[PDB]
Design a protein around this ligand. Structure first.
Ligand code: NA
Lengths: 16, 16
């Protein structure tokens, strides 16, 4: 269903 | 900034 695996791109919110 | 790397968890939207 949909496209890819999961929601969004990466892990969490931001960088660090 | 924030926590982690990127936005969300995974790659795209769904599974497949
Ligand atoms: Na395909």
């Amino acid at each position: 269903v949909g496209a890819x695996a999961x929601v969004x791109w990466x892990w969490x919110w931001x960088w660090x």
